[PDB]
Amino acid sequence: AIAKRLEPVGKVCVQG
Amino acid sequence: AIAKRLEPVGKVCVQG
Amino acid sequence: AGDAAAGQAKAAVCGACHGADGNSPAPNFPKLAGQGERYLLKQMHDIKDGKRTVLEMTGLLTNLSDQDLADIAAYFASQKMSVGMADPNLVAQGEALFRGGKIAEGMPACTGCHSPSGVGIATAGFPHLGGQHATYVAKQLTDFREGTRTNDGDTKIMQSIAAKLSNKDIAAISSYIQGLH
Amino acid sequence: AGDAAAGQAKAAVCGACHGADGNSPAPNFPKLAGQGERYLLKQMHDIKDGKRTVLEMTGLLTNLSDQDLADIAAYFASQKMSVGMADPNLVAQGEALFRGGKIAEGMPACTGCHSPSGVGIATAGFPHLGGQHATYVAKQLTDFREGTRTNDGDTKIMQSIAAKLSNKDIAAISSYIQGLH
Amino acid sequence: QLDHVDIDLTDKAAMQDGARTFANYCMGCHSAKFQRYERVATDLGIPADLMMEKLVFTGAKIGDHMDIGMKPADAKTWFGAAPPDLTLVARVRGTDWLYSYLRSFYEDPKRPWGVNNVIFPNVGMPNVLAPLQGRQVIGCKQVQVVEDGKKQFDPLTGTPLTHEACDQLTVVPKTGELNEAQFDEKVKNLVTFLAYSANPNKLASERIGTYVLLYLAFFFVFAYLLKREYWK
Amino acid sequence: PQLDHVDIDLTDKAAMQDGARTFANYCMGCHSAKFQRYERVATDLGIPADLMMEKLVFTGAKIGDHMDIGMKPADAKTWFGAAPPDLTLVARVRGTDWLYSYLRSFYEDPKRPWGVNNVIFPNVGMPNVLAPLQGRQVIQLTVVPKTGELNEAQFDEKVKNLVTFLAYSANPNKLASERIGTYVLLYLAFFFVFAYLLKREYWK
Ligand code: HEC
Ligand code: HEC
Ligand code: HEC
Ligand code: HEC
Ligand code: HEC
Ligand code: HEC
């Protein structure tokens, strides 16, 4: 619950 | 006199 | 403000290098899709006036008027930049640099002026970065570091910021930005 | 310790690239004349064992024993490095960096480990710099900065120091070192 | 004219969302250097590992201050004004001022960063929450009709009775991730976290003060009796 | 160890100027003098401010700045195995005789990391940075002939001037201290005469 609340805004799409 | 006494050790050759 | 509808027609010549919608397929050509209209217009004016040197664009903007440039910038800003993929071996370092900067060296994080998601600030002219080609982003960071690109203004925002990035840092952050969204 | 007399005969093959007396004519080849014997021997052994990669030297030291390398190093140390000229447009910045380093960035001045005149410290293994080819010094600083050259030890002395040098800083300091004596 | 916001410092979830917003959208330029990640995690109820993974982007330790890489002098040169440290900004400006300021950015081409602020006119801050709020402009929109404080709501639906006004902050539709209520909640959580950061001892202060006042009332009873008696 | 005595003269402006030159060129590479300012050194040594900036300020600092250096203590401690201490107060920490014997006691010792050892400071982490001037000194200490710019007397004079500058740096107030103390003691003797006479008069 806290982890979802604290998710960083920037999402990076990575190879594999 | 003082200027000679304080001359930096490192001497550099320069083009022209 | 420019007209995206007319910019689409006026941007056909550009689509040869940047792609029809502004999502260039080749890494060395930047993606203009989704880029801030203010930033796009500033870059096009700089290239017209020689403030930014793009040899591949020699004479392409000379015949385009201010309204044509505004229309093209609006058309490209009306698109969506496709998101690339970050190198797994570099994504950690690039992410750390982008989100945190360097406290010790006093380098800012990129998440302030460019959003945490890399969308930039369109009104402020801070360019969209997320999804931009890693090769192009690395080239721009190198050019800022060496002073090759100086159209960031007298304040030298990006010249100063890139002065603190090593080549490995530049590569890692470019790879991270390529996949950032 | 090595014997300079025998080293002269043993060092003839090297003179093709580094010059008969160790004062190489070509900028890309380092001058070995007047270089510290300890530093020369360390570099020879590092190139032999792969700690330092010199493609042009591939296999040249494989057949040379420890005594032969010591003799060659002693011969080259007995010589006197020739002094080049510094670029007038770069001598000021290079001199500033060499003598004062960077207070703000924490980069040391080079006059400590390398003498104020660039003669190095022979006993400590700190190489003689003054009069070395500007191109070679720039390449060495670039390799240290990029981690290409890592034979400076676990302390990473020169890697750490060169991490703080920009390309312009490297160019200016290399020119000054070439003119230095 | 500021807008009131009811900030609940006992809401751990709201403070957590505010901390996430601050760490992502604000610590790019603003430090919270008088405040440690460890204390923020302890007070917000965030596990230390979770705080490390989710809110510490600068490579700092858990016990380190919320410092950022952007130096005040560099940022003053770049923006025209140094982004102040935001640890105490809730105390410096108040929570209502912050709530109104972070929701009052509107496009203004005459300005260096293309935006201005109703609360902080000619502010040097770029509108960094534009992606969330969306494009906000000084235009015409429906505002509740008021006549000398006579505020009209709809008796049946309970919604305001509105008339058009052309000097109002209006968000251009479909320009931001969050609607007006969602951005209001985001800004409320951020200002709640800033209020906590400015005064991290508030809740403990209230508890300790309650106990102190109870003890002092007890002691006052005894001292008053010892006085009135012995004064006979 | 047994130290060599050196008579340090803090009134010798020329000697202190030569010592400042040697410190700026050969010692500020690794050592800071961060507790003194270039301006005060220039004023006390009789060096004009422009001359001081041109000849002794290599770091790009202002005349009024502390004599800081780029080499950070942590990096130097990593590199040399020991941090080069700030030398502003070293003449008070060690004394001028110890410094004079130490800077002349470097000899070649291959077993050591930097190829040298010191009689005064065994197993010291300093590289022999004055080897170009003194020459190759080997073990009793003897200098290999035709290995340094200076002979024994010239190098002794160089080290003496450097140690004199270090002594001034440790105690920049010594000359003013003596000048002021002379007058203070004269006034105190003058006042003692009056106080003693007053006490004698009252105690009759
Ligand atoms: C979360 C998105 C943020 C919040 C909340 C705040 N900031 Fe900023 N900011 C920036 C600058 C250059 C300034 C100075 C402008 C000026 O002085 O004219 C500011 C100012 C503020 C203030 C005003 C504080 C005061 O006492 O007046 C507040 C309350 C504030 N900021 C809150 C720049 C930036 C920035 C760089 C792009 C970012 C990412 C943020 N600000 C983020 C936030
Ligand atoms: C190939 C012949 C090109 C055509 C046709 C157009 N552009 Fe381009 N452009 C090209 C390159 C190789 C680059 C990158 C330069 C560099 O420094 O690496 C660019 C760059 C731009 C930019 C800057 C993008 C940014 O900073 O994010 C803009 C705004 C731009 N180009 C606009 C533009 C327009 C309007 C064009 C049609 C009139 C156009 N480009 C054509 C190569 C080529
Ligand atoms: C050309 C085919 C070469 C011959 C013949 C020899 N060397 Fe060389 N050397 C060469 C290059 C291009 C370089 C520089 C490598 C780099 O990283 O840029 C070198 C370098 C050295 C060094 C290091 C000198 C220094 O300043 O650190 C040493 C000690 C050295 N080489 C020794 C050496 C000896 C003993 C040789 C004969 C057996 C010899 N070199 C031949 C190219 C060439
Ligand atoms: C880097 C190449 C150095 C330069 C140039 C000089 N010194 Fe140094 N010094 C250096 C180190 C790493 C150390 C510590 C050695 C250890 O084992 O602790 C020192 C130490 C000294 C000292 C000793 C001071 C003390 O122990 O309190 C003195 C007096 C000293 N150094 C003097 C000195 C002088 C006069 C120099 C210029 C001639 C000089 N140092 C240069 C590293 C380096
Ligand atoms: C504060 C303002 C910053 C911050 C902290 C960073 N950048 Fe960015 N940047 C900024 C501006 C004003 C501009 C526009 C420059 C111009 O008008 O010519 C840029 C631009 C870039 C670019 C070029 C984008 C493109 O060519 O499409 C890149 C690649 C870039 N910036 C990267 C970058 C990185 C990696 C940062 C953190 C290390 C970073 N920026 C921070 C302003 C600012
Ligand atoms: C003290 C530690 C220093 C500092 C302050 C500087 N250097 Fe130098 N350096 C040092 C060592 C121990 C070595 C040997 C590296 C090895 O064993 O491989 C070097 C070497 C160099 C070289 C290589 C020269 C050559 O290949 O012949 C160069 C070019 C060099 N160092 C340059 C340099 C510069 C420009 C400095 C100031 C910015 C500098 N060094 C400082 C030790 C030390």
Q: Cα–Cα distance between F174 and E213 in angstroms, integer?
A: 61
With a CB cutoff of 8 Å and minimum separation 6, the contacts of D75 are D2, D3, D4, D5, D6, D7, D8, D10, D11, D22
Q: Cα–Cα distance between D2 and D74 in angstroms, integer?
A: 5
Torsion of CA C46, C48, C50, C56, to 10 degrees: 100
Which neighbouring-strand residues pair with B14? Answer: D86
CB atoms under 10 Å from CB of E134, counted, come to: 18
Residue ranges of alpha helices (H) inside chain A are 2-5
Query: Which three-class secondary structure state does DSSP give residue D171?
Result: helix
Q: Cα–Cα distance between E26 and E24 in angstroms, integer?
A: 6
Query: Which three-class secondary structure state does DSSP give residue F188?
Result: helix
Q: How many helices (H) and strands (E) does chain F have?
A: 9, 6
Rg of chain B in Å (alpha carbons): 10
Q: Cα–Cα distance between E209 and C148 in angstroms, integer?
A: 62
Nearest-CA neighbor of D114 among D176, D54, D70? D176
Residue D121 is encoded by which pair of tokens?
């410290």
Q: Which residues of C touch A (CB under 8 A)?
A: 83-88, 91, 95, 98-99, 111, 115-118, 130, 176, 179-181
DSSP 8-class letter at F66:
E
Q: Cα–Cα distance between C141 and C147 in angstroms, integer?
A: 10
Distances, alpha carbon E77 to alpha carbons C52, E70, E83, E143, E154, in Å? 22, 11, 11, 40, 51
With a CB cutoff of 8 Å and minimum separation 6, the contacts of C127 are C35, C36, C39, C114, C120
Which neighbouring-strand residues pair with E144? Answer: E162
Q: Cα–Cα distance between C94 and C86 in angstroms, integer?
A: 9
Hey, CA dihedral for F122, F125, F130, F132, is it positive or negative?
positive
With a CB cutoff of 8 Å and minimum separation 6, the contacts of C117 are A9, A10, A11, C130, C180, C181, E131
DSSP 8-class letter at E117:
E
Q: Cα–Cα distance between C115 and F21 in angstroms, integer?
A: 52
Residue F143 belongs to what H/E stretch?
Answer: strand F142-143
Please, which experimental method was used? Answer: cryo-EM
Residues in the annotated binding site of C for heme c = 14, 17-18, 57, 110, 113-114, 158
Taking CA atoms only, the protein residue closest to ligand 4 atom 34 is: F27
CA of C162 to the centre of ligand 2 (A): 21
Residue F34 belongs to what H/E stretch?
Answer: strand F33-37
Phi-psi region of F115 (alpha: psi -120 to 50; beta: other; left: phi over 0): left
**Does A12 touch chain E if contact means CB atoms closer than 8 Å?**
no
Read off φ and ψ for residue E32, nearest 5 degrees: -130, 50
DSSP 8-class letter at D103:
T
The residue assigned the tokens 């100086």 is C150
Q: Cα–Cα distance between E58 and C76 in angstroms, integer?
A: 34
Distances, alpha carbon C116 to alpha carbons C96, E55, E58, in Å? 12, 12, 13
Q: Which residues of B touch D (CB under 8 A)?
A: 8-16
Q: Please judge whether C168 and D146 are an interchain contact, meaning their C-beta atoms are less than 8 angstroms apart.
A: yes
Residue E80 is encoded by which pair of tokens?
């025209």
CB of residue C157 inside a 6 A radius of ligand 5? yes
CA of D157 to the centre of ligand 6 (A): 7
- How would you label D147-171 residue by residue, b for 16+ Cβ within 10 Å and e otherwise? eebbbbeeebbbbbbbebbebbbbb
Residue ranges of alpha helices (H) inside chain E are 12-21, 37-44, 48-54, 72-79, 89-93, 95-101, 130-133, 180-198, 202-228
Residue F38 is encoded by which pair of tokens?
């270039």
The residue assigned the tokens 């969602």 is E182
The CA-to-CA distance between both ends of chain E, in Å, stands at 59
The CA-to-CA distance between both ends of chain D, in Å, stands at 27
From E27, E31, E68, E78, the mutation candidate for ligand 5 (largest count of ligand atoms within 8 A of CB) is E78
- How would you label C158-168 residue by residue, b for 16+ Cβ within 10 Å and e otherwise? bbbbbbbbbbe
Distance of residue E173 Cα from the nearest chain C Cα, in angstroms: 15
- CB F36 within 8 Å of CB F67: yes
If you measure CA to CA, which chain C residue comes closest to A16? Answer: C88
Residues with CB under 6 A from ligand 4: D 112-113; F 26-27, 29-31, 80, 82, 84-85, 87, 90, 93-94, 99, 102-103, 124-127, 129-130, 162
Residue F108 is encoded by which pair of tokens?
């070649």
Per-state percent for chain C, helix, strand, coil, to nearest 5: 45, 5, 50
Resolution in A: 2.7
- CB D144 within 8 Å of CB D110: no
Which neighbouring-strand residues pair with E106? Answer: E116
- CB D54 within 8 Å of CB D47: yes
Inter-chain Cβ pairs, chain C and chain E, closer than 8 A: 93
Domains, chain C, in order of start with CATH, read 1-82 (1.10.760.10), 83-181 (1.10.760.10)
